[PDB]
C-alpha cells in the first residue's frame, strides 16, 4: 500500500497555478480524506494547508485520489508539498499515508 504524488518535482514561474495530485494505491480500504503539508526550503518544519485563499484541494472518493490546486504562485511558495492520506470505514484502520513529496521551485 503506497501513495504517489505523481508530480513529485517541478519548477514554474511566479504568477501561475500548479496542481499536485495524491493517489492512494494498492489499498482495499477507501480513502477518507487528505491532509496537505508544506515545508519551506531550508526549513524542516511542516505547515498544514487549509481550503481557501490560493489553496484549493479536490478529493475524489471513488478513485481514492486527491489533488491540491495551488494558484497564484509567489517565490515564498517554493517548497516541498506533502499529501497525507487517510483510510477509514469498517475494519479499515485510520492510517497516515505520506506520499513522496513534491519539491516546487518558483522563480
Amino acid at each position: 500500500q503506497r501513495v504517489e504524488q505523481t508530480p513529485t518535482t517541478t519548477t514554474k514561474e511566479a504568477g501561475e497555478s500548479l496542481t499536485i495530485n495524491c493517489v492512494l494505491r494498492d489499498s482495499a480500504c477507501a480513502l477518507d480524506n487528505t491532509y496537505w503539508y508544506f515545508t519551506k526550503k531550508g526549513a524542516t518544519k511542516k505547515e498544514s494547508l487549509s481550503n481557501g485563499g490560493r489553496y484549493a484541494e479536490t478529493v475524489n472518493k471513488a478513485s481514492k485520489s486527491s489533488s491540491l490546486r495551488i494558484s497564484d504562485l509567489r517565490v515564498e511558495d517554493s517548497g516541498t508539498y506533502h499529501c497525507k492520506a487517510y483510510t477509514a470505514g469498517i475494519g479499515c484502520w485510520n492510517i497516515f499515508y505520506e506520499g513522496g513529496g513534491t519539491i516546487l521551485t518558483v522563480k
Binding site: 475494519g91 485510520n94 497516515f96
Partner: protein, 500 residues
C-alpha cells in the same frame, strides 16, 4: 430494616453484574464479527512498540523481549526501549537488551521532558534501527514520553503499543490490539486483556481470577460503550496521533498543583476521553504479567491505585458529558462504585452495632451465593474449573481493598516510624476494629437455644459456611501440592529459570 437492606444489596449487585455481563458479551460478539471480516495476513498498520522499565528482573525482561520479537506481526517499524537508569546498576537492563536486539544503546545525559527541545532528534538520528535509551531516573511518564517522541519521530508509526517491562506478550496480542480500531476510526485506544500468570499463592491465584473478571467484564462492558475508563499498562494500544495529542498534556499532569507522579494509567486515558475519542477493549489479546504475592505490597499497590482512581474520577465525570448519549454508562459505573463502597461500609457498621446473629448469617449466605454465581460464570467463560477459587475473594477484598481505600482518602489531603505508619496504620486499625466487633458480637450473643428455629437456622448456616470454606481451602491445598493450580506458562517459566 436489615432484611430490606440485604435484599436491596443483593438485587442491586446482581443486577449490575448481569448488566455488565450482557454488555461484555455483546462487546465480544461485536469484536468477533469485526475479526470475521479481517483479511488474511493483514499488516496494514505500522506499529512501533514501546517498553518502559526500571530495576526489572533480568530473566523476566529477557522473556518479555523474547515474546516481543516472537510476535507474528509483520509491520513493526521498530522497538523503542526506554529505561530511566543512568546508573551502573541499570546497565544490567542494557546488557539484557543488547543480548536480544541490536547492540547499539544511547545514553543521553538529559531528559527530553526537562529539555528545552522536546524533539528526539537531539538524542536520536536513525529511525530504522531499534534504539534503547538510558536516562536519569525520573520515574514513569517521562520515560514513556521519551519513547513517544522516538515513536512519533518515525512517521510510519501509526500506533504505539505500550508494554511494561514485566509483561509476557503473545505473537497475536499485537495485531490483536492493533486492529480493533480499524473497525471504528473513533477508537483511539485499545485495552489489551492482561493475565496474572503467577498463581502459586492463594493471593496471586485470587488476584488472577480477579484480573480475569475485571478485564473480561467491566472492561468488556465499557468497551462495548467504546469508553474503557482505563487502558492496560502491560498490554495497551494507542494511536500515534492521539498519543502525540495527549502525550504532552499527560506528561504535564499536576493534581492540586503537583505533578502527579503516580499511575499514569488513567490520566492519558482520561485525556483521550476528554477529547471525545472512543476507547474499545478486546479480550482476544492477552499479555501475561506477574502479580504481588505479599499482603503488604498488595496493600500499598492497591492504595496507590485507589489514589489514582479518586484523583481521576473528578475529571472523568467532568469530561463524561462530552460523549453526548454515550458516557451515561460511565457515570452510572462510577456512581455505582462510590455508592457500593458506602453501602458496604454502612452495612458493616450496622452489623457491628446491632450484633444480630440472624443478620450476620443472612449476609454471609447471600455473599456466598453472589460469589458462587460469579465463580460459576467465570468457570463457564474460561472453560476452566479453577475459577471457583474466586469465592474466597470476599476475604481479601474486605481485608485489603477497604483499608487501602481509607488510606487513600485520608492521605489525599494534608523518622521511619511516621512513614511506616502512613502505609499500614489504617490497615492495622481496621483489623483491630473488625476483630473487636467480632468478639463483642460473640459475647453479646453468648447463649444457646435449640428450641428457637431462627437460632437453629443461624447456627446451621454458619456451620455450613465454615465447612464450605474449609473444604475449599483443603482442595486448594491439595491442588497446590500437586501443582495443578499452576498456570500453563508458569511451568516452562520455572523450567528455563532452573535451566539457567
Amino acid at each position: 430494616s436489615a432484611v430490606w437492606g440485604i435484599s436491596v444489596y443483593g438485587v442491586f449487585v446482581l443486577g449490575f453484574y448481569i448488566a455488565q455481563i450482557v454488555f461484555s458479551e455483546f462487546n465480544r460478539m461485536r469484536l468477533s464479527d469485526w475479526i470475521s471480516l479481517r483479511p488474511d495476513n493483514w499488516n496494514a498498520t505500522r506499529v512501533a512498540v514501546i517498553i518502559a522499565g526500571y530495576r526489572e528482573d533480568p530473566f523476566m525482561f529477557k522473556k518479555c523481549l523474547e515474546s516481543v520479537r516472537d510476535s507474528e506481526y509483520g509491520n513493526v517499524a521498530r522497538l523503542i526501549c526506554v529505561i530511566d537508569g543512568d546508573e551502573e546498576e541499570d546497565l544490567k537492563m542494557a546488557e539484557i537488551y543488547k543480548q536480544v536486539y541490536n547492540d547499539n544503546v544511547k545514553k543521553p545525559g538529559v531528559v527530553l521532558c526537562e529539555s528545552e527541545n522536546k524533539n528526539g532528534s537531539t538524542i536520536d538520528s536513525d529511525v530504522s534501527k531499534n534504539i534503547c535509551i538510558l536516562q536519569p531516573h525520573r520515574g514513569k511518564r517521562e520515560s514513556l514520553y521519551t519513547g513517544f517522541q522516538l515513536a512519533s519521530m518515525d512517521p510510519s508509526v501509526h500506533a504505539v503499543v505500550l508494554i511494561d517491562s514485566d509483561t509476557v506478550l503473545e505473537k497475536n496480542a499485537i495485531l490483536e490490539v492493533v486492529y480493533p480500531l480499524s473497525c471504528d476510526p473513533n477508537i483511539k485506544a485499545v485495552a489489551g486483556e492482561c493475565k496474572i500468570w503467577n498463581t502459586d499463592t492463594i493471593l496471586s491465584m485470587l488476584v488472577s481470577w480477579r484480573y480475569f473478571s475485571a478485564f473480561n467484564v467491566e472492561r468488556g462492558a465499557q468497551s462495548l460503550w467504546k469508553t474503557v475508563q482505563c487502558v492496560g499498562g502491560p498490554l495497551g494500544a494507542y494511536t500515534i496521533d492521539i498519543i502525540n495529542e495527549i502525550k504532552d498534556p499527560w506528561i504535564t499532569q499536576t493534581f492540586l498543583g503537583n505533578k502527579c507522579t503516580y499511575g499514569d494509567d488513567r490520566r492519558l486515558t482520561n485525556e483521550v476521553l476528554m477529547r471525545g475519542k472512543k476507547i474499545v477493549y478486546t479480550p482476544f489479546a492477552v499479555g501475561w504479567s506477574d502479580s504481588p504475592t505479599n499482603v503488604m505490597r498488595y496493600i500499598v499497590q492497591q492504595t496507590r491505585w485507589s489514589k489514582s482512581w479518586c484523583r481521576e474520577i473528578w475529571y472523568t465525570l467532568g469530561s463524561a458529558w462530552k460523549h453526548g448519549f454515550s458516557g451515561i454508562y460511565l457515570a452510572f459505573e462510577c456512581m455505582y462504585q462510590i455508592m457500593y463502597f458506602f453501602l458496604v461500609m454502612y452495612l458493616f457498621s450496622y452489623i457491628a452495632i446491632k450484633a444480630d446473629i440472624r443478620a450476620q448469617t443472612a449476609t454471609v449466605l447471600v455473599s456466598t451465593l453472589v460469589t458462587i454465581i460469579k465463580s460459576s460464570y467465570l468457570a463457564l467463560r474460561a472453560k476452566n474449573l479453577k475459577a471457583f477459587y474466586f469465592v474466597l475473594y470476599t476475604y481479601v477484598y474486605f481485608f485489603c481493598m477497604i483499608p487501602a481505600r481509607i488510606t487513600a482518602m485520608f492521605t489525599m489531603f494534608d523518622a521511619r516510624v511516621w512513614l511506616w505508619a502512613k502505609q499500614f496504620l489504617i490497615t492495622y486499625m481496621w483489623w483491630a476494629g473488625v476483630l473487636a466487633a467480632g468478639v463483642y458480637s460473640i459475647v453479646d450473643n453468648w447463649y444457646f437455644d435449640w428450641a428457637d428455629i431462627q437460632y437453629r437456622f443461624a447456627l446451621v448456616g454458619i456451620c455450613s459456611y465454615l465447612v464450605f470454606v474449609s473444604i475449599v481451602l483443603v482442595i486448594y491445598l491439595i491442588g497446590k501440592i500437586t501443582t495443578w493450580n499452576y498456570t500453563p506458562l508458569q511451568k516452562e517459566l520455572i523450567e528455563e529459570r532452573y535451566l539457567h
